[PDB]
């Protein structure tokens, strides 16, 4: 089967505006370069929340004052997003792309609905 990217269906941000979720994926070959992108979908519009490239055998790292922080044990990432406000409520999609060596592969996550309230 094709690359599969899975993430929880719903996450609630803490009262401090911090939300965490795992993005885990089943990869085809041995890519040496992987792009991980977090997109927010709402209101027929999409924006990039954060993105990072990882290479070698390193942990996905977001650089530098990003609102996103990550880990990674193999082909998965625990993402943490800070500074969220009520207006940031929406669908957060993890996109994973195998970039190098070719061929390219695309993996789009099912999406995590993040709910945020202003304390």
């Amino acid at each position, epitope marked *: 089967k*094709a*690359m599969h990217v899975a993430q929880p269906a719903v996450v609630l941000a803490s009262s401090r505006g911090i939300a965490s979720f795992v993005c885990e994926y089943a990869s085809p070959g041995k890519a040496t370069e992987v792009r991980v992108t977090v997109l927010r979908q709402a209101d027929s519009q*999409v924006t990039e929340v954060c993105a990072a490239t990882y290479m070698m055998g390193n942990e996905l790292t977001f650089l530098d004052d990003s609102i996103c922080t990550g880990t990674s044990s193999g082909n998965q990432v625990n993402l943490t997003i800070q500074g969220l406000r009520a207006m940031d409520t929406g669908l957060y999609i993890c996109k994973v792309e195998l970039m190098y060596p070719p*061929p390219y592969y*695309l993996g*789009i996550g099912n999406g995590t609905q993040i709910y945020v309230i202003d304390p």
Partner: antibody
Amino acid sequence: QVQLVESGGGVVQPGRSLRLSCAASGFTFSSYGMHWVRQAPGKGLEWVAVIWYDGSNKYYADSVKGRFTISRDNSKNTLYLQMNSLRAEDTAVYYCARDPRGATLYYYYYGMDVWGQGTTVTVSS
Amino acid sequence: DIQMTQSPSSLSASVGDRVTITCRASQSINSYLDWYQQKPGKAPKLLIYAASSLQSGVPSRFSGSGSGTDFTLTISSLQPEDFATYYCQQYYSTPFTFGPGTKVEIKR
């Protein structure tokens, strides 16, 4: 009034080279992935190459690997295809086309939603 | 690379007919499939993306379905402007391959 205008096509001798250009107007070119797709006379569509919005990554059909180079100059709203070592079987109409690659409207919106009119390349002596 | 196949090669239909054509990938491509229409002398036009989403401005009689290896494009009621050739294309993995196309022609 989004526009993609190809140029550079014509007759070229086998073994020789040609550069195609695709000029964009009426949209934010630097936000879109771009592809080349070709169509030989009486035949179907064949995908040739893609280049990322910022030029950071590119991929190619196996039939043109090692011979064609895709590039772009976002400061000039222009996409290029450098074609080397041309063969009779490369004879075709060459189209350029944009692709939002999930960066506008919906995160899953991938596809060539606007195409140029094509430029014809005839490889012959 | 991923081989895309399409059936039938040609089909003859009449205005008002429900028409369904199929596309198959040689390995799973999830839902990463576009459908295009092309008429002679003209550039292709995107109809369907992500296997089942309708491109803006495309009539609602067009629909698509499938995920994995087998896909369909349906026209619920064929109109005169729908006689054309239809191509599928996968964008899961490079090269982003097209199917060989299906021609929808007028029955007589």
